Design a protein around this ligand. Structure first.
Ligand SMILES: Cc1cc2nc3c(=O)[nH]c(=O)nc-3n(C[C@H](O)[C@H](O)[C@H](O)COP(=O)(O)OP(=O)(O)OC[C@H]3O[C@@H](n4cnc5c(N)ncnc54)[C@H](O)[C@@H]3O)c2cc1C
Ligand SMILES: Cc1nc2c(=O)[nH]c(=O)nc-2n(C[C@H](O)[C@H](O)[C@H](O)CO)c1C
Ligand code: SF4
Ligand SMILES: [Gd]
Ligand SMILES: [Mg+2]
Length: 508
């Protein structure tokens, strides 16, 4: 009569569907720290540490609430290699004939649990604002998807920034106001960091010993490891940084890795925060004249729009999504991505902070590291491995669409009809990187030519047949055509030379 109740490491929510369905008197909660989940990609040590530590804390909390918990520690030699091995073990110990599980957000894990010779009753993950079945319904018959239309509908369903049947402040979307560079500022707060207690430190010591060859600096470790801490991170952001969120959303500063971003993605993704509570707090700040509407709406749109939309695309696209390669790109990831030196200031900055903090803000992920990998023709499978490995907040469901779709343009165009690529001019306008860089951003050719200046046109040229039949990009080819033929030839000869060095592993 005992049933197993699985709680995975991204399911640390009090009101998790599986827990709702359990009988604390009869059922056994099962949690397991296992090598398979620690190595399916070589996760940033900070990520591994975050999950294991939050797992232990949550297990103890489940005990405080009355559940019986069977917890398999990574450092127990009795622990098996996978979530499945531990479910089976506990079935044997217990007599249970069935496990209940909130459906995870990783296709490989889904399949593993189905393949397990123990039946699993899956429940939907209801921690999103848009239910799966409702996302599917909204998309049906649409020959083209666009996040914006989905977002407006989510605004209406939820009531967020809605004054009647009208959007707050008389228009829907304020992204046009959120695209300026930012200045250094004494009055700009730094986000809240958290010191590990002894139990987190025990996990840090474990991860250092057990996963030494993964890319990333483990210490200092500063992320929230339970709900109490995450709520403080929330409060900090709402009070101190939300009013700048809009003006500074696309900015980059060589000396500030965080600017005014919330640094909440990991907390939301593991279940420590929920999106409604986050969006509502932000809305209140507008209603009380503390945060401007471009800021609050910009913030909400990232969670209510993109986060939700991305989850939907993941769900619909299935287990073969990560095999998408619409542009036929096949190059290795350059060594600079795993920390080898590069003279490109922007990339260096981004990879360095990814190494050290397990965190890059959105515009870095999209327009620096993402943009460069696309321009250089890296296989999207390789880009996908990297983003899913290196960031504190990375799990398949949220990383895959952002990486394969939004950034690498490898899919059907569901996350943007125009690829996010640029020349160096864009990085120059939005950051202060270029003055410190050995490359010359204003040079279109020559030994000092910014590599984005070469690869941008090379990219457009090599994919002209497909992109020129694309309204939103016809202009760019017009500008290319109006240039002397010898200038074009030189640009391509030089991009080609660069690419040869890049993909040979030469420092660039
Ligand atoms: C190539 C690529 C890979 C990405 N991988 C991840 C990932 O693994 N995990 C992840 O949570 N986000 C991912 N993103 C989206 C976004 O970059 C991060 O969510 C954001 O950087 C998290 O930092 P923050 O908390 O400071 O976010 P903020 O800038 O403060 O934004 C606020 C919140 O909005 C949400 N958000 C904003 N953009 C997105 C997005 N496009 N998709 C989903 N949520 C969004 C997050 O919950 C975030 O906490 C990726 C984006 C790109 C381009
Ligand atoms: C590194 C890691 N380790 C574990 C683990 O040891 N045990 C566990 O239950 N979950 C872990 N996770 C999170 C899962 O991989 C997660 O459920 C999927 O990545 C997405 O739902 C991760 C990411
Ligand atoms: S010149 Fe080019 S490579 Fe150097 S920081 Fe600017 S955009 Fe990056
Ligand atoms: Gd492939
Ligand atoms: Mg933007």
């Amino acid at each position: 009569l005992t049933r197993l109740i699985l709680v995975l490491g991204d399911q640390l929510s009090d009101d998790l569907p599986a827990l709702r369905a359990a009988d604390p008197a009869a059922d056994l909660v099962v949690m397991a720290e296992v090598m398979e989940e620690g190595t399916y990609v070589p996760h940033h040590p900070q990520k591994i540490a975050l999950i294991l530590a939050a797992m232990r804390k949550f297990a103890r909390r489940l005990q405080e609430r009355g559940f019986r918990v069977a917890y398999s520690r990574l450092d127990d030699p009795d622990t098996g290699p996978s979530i499945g091995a531990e479910l089976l073990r506990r079935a044997a110990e217990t007599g249970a004939r069935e496990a209940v599980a909130t459906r995870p957000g990783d296709w490989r894990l889904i399949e593993a649990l189905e393949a397990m010779p123990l039946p699993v009753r899956f429940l939907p993950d209801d921690r999103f604002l848009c239910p799966a079945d409702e996302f599917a319904r909204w998309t049906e018959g649409r020959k083209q998807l666009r996040m914006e239309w989905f977002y407006r509908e989510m605004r209406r369903r939820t009531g967020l920034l809605m004054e009647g049947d009208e959007p707050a402040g008389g228009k829907w979307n304020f992204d046009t106001e959120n695209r300026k560079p930012a200045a250094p500022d004494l009055l700009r707060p730094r986000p809240l960091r958290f010191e590990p207690d002894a139990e987190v430190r025990a996990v840090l010591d474990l991860v250092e010993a057990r996963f030494p060859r993964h890319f990333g600096r483990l210490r200092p470790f500063h992320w929230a490891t339970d709900r109490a801490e995450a709520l403080r991170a929330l409060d900090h952001f709402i009070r101190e940084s939300l009013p700048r969120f809009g003006d500074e959303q696309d900015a980059m500063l060589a000396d500030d890795p965080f600017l005014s971003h919330a640094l909440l993605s990991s907390s939301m993704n593991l279940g420590l925060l929920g999106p409604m509570e986050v969006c509502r707090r932000a809305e209140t700040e507008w209603r009380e004249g503390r945060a401007p509407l471009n800021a609050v709406e910009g913030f909400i749109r990232q969670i209510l729009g993109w986060r939700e939309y991305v989850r939907g695309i993941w769900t619909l696209s299935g287990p073969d999504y990560i095999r998408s390669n619409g542009l036929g790109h096949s190059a290795a990831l350059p060594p600079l991505y795993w920390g080898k030196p590069t003279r490109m200031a922007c990339l260096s900055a981004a990879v360095a902070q990814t190494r050290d903090l397990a965190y890059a803000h959105h515009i870095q992920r999209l327009m620096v590291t993402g943009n460069f990998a696309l321009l250089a023709g890296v296989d999207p499978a390789e880009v996908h491995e990297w983003y899913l490995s290196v960031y504190i907040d990375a799990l398949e469901w949220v990383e895959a669409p952002n990486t394969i779709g939004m950034s690498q343009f490898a899919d059907h165009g569901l996350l943007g009809s125009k690829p996010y690529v640029s020349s160096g001019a864009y990085i120059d306008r939005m950051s202060d990187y270029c003055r410190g860089c050995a490359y010359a951003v204003k040079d279109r050719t020559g030994p000092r030519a910014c590599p984005f200046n070469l690869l941008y046109w090379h990219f457009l040229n090599r994919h002209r047949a497909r992109f020129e039949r694309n309204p939103r990009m016809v202009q760019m080819y017009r500008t290319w055509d109006r240039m002397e033929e010898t200038h074009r030839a030189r640009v391509l000869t030089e991009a080609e030379a660069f690419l040869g060095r890049l993909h040979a592993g030469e420092p660039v």
